[PDB]
Structure 1
Amino acid sequence: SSPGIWQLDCTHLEGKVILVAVHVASGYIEAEVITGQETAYFLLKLAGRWPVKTVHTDNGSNFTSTTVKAACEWAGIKQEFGIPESMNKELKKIIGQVRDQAEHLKTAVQMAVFIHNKKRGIGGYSAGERIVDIIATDI
């Protein structure tokens, strides 16, 4: 039972910070180029869109943001340390494939997210379909 289990991490590119959330069971990702207020905002707007019940991070930075805890409490997210970067260097390759189609890094990040979530291998389901499948199976 991992419908609402997510992984949260940072990555960096062109001197900017990319927050990345991974739905662990599906591989589905959401990201944004941005501190604690920013992380809390990102988590709230994630949690309004998917079932978000547990978020795992692997360092201490999110345990020291008062707004992040406030977001956790408001939305009912347990923020837990540990495990339930192949994804960040998979996201970075795609960002590289597209970087010249957009003026802003923002945009190239979101095109890369698009491709990651929509792409297949050939057959089966994309990450975007799996997360919907997982959730639909759930209720």
Structure 2
Amino acid sequence: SPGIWQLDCTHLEGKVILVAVHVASGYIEAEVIPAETGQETAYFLLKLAGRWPVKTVHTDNGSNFTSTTVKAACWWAGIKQEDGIPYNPQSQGVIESMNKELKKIIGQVRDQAEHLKTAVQMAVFIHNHKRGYSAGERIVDIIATDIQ
């Protein structure tokens, strides 16, 4: 559980927002890309695994589960690649709610930048800092406890 992440893809302004969520804490990382490809997903995972101890990634769809480039990034980074089937149905709702919340925050900051990528990083900041612990505090505490 300290090492489990979930990929999530949502759309805004004709672009794709790729999100990785640390399941146990709700902490997120995100980026803006023109379209979701295996190559871009692979690169996103390489970045993620260099920054946090990623043991397992539940992929966001079957195309990314199948992608040889995504499989190659998971091999490279020592990540167990898994499907994202919501065997627990509450998983769908949680991700849906998170996407709605993210878009709401993006709307609240949207006029503070020209480019969507900038607004998305402001939204990541606000989400991770919101408290009563924050998601950012929770992920560090969870991982630190696991190390000790």
Shorter-chain TM range is over 0.9
Which blocks of at least 5 consecutive residues in structure 1 are unaligned?
none
**How many residue pairs were aligned?**
134
User: Could you give the per-residue CA deviations for residues 49-108 of structure 1, whole angstroms, max 9, x where no partner exists?
Assistant: 10111111252011232211110001111111135x211111111001000001100000
Distance 1:59 1:75 in 2: 20
Name the SS of the counterpart of 1:48 in structure 2.
helix
SS at structure 2 position matched to 1:21 = strand
- The question of whether the paired residues in 1 share the 8 Å contact of 2:105 and 2:123 is answered with yes
Residues in 2 aligned to 1:6 and 1:98: alpha-carbon distance in whole angstroms: 26
Cα shift readout 1:18-55 (whole Å, capped 9, x = no counterpart): 00000000000000001111111110010011011111
CA change 1:71–1:58 in 2 (3 A) is: closer
Unpaired runs of 5+ in structure 2?
Answer: 86-95
Match of 1:62 in 2: 64
Distance 1:41 1:82 in 2: 19
In structure 2, C-alpha distance between the alignment counterparts of 1:58 and 1:100, rounded to whole Å: 29
Shift of 1:7: 0.7
Determine if contact 2:57/2:81 at 8 Å carries over to the other structure: yes
Q: How does 1:27-106 map to 2 (within 5 A)?
A: 27-34=26-33, 35-82=37-84, 85-106=96-117
CA apart distance, 1:125: 1.0
2:130 paired with 1:119: yes
Q: Give the distance between the partners of 2:60 and 2:77, measured in 1 at CA.
A: 21
Q: TM-score, normalised by structure 2?
A: 0.87
Aligned partners of 2:53, 2:142: CA distance in 1, in Å?
Answer: 11
How big is the alpha-carbon RMSD for the aligned residues of Structure 1 and Structure 2?
A: 1.0
Higher helix proportion: 2
Are the equivalent residues in 1 in contact too, given 2:6–2:84 (CA < 8 A)?
no
Task: Give, in whole Å, the separation in 2 of the partners of 1:12 and 1:72.
Answer: 24
Alignment correspondent of 1:10: 9
Inter-CA distance 48–8: structure 2 relative to 1 (3 Å threshold):
same
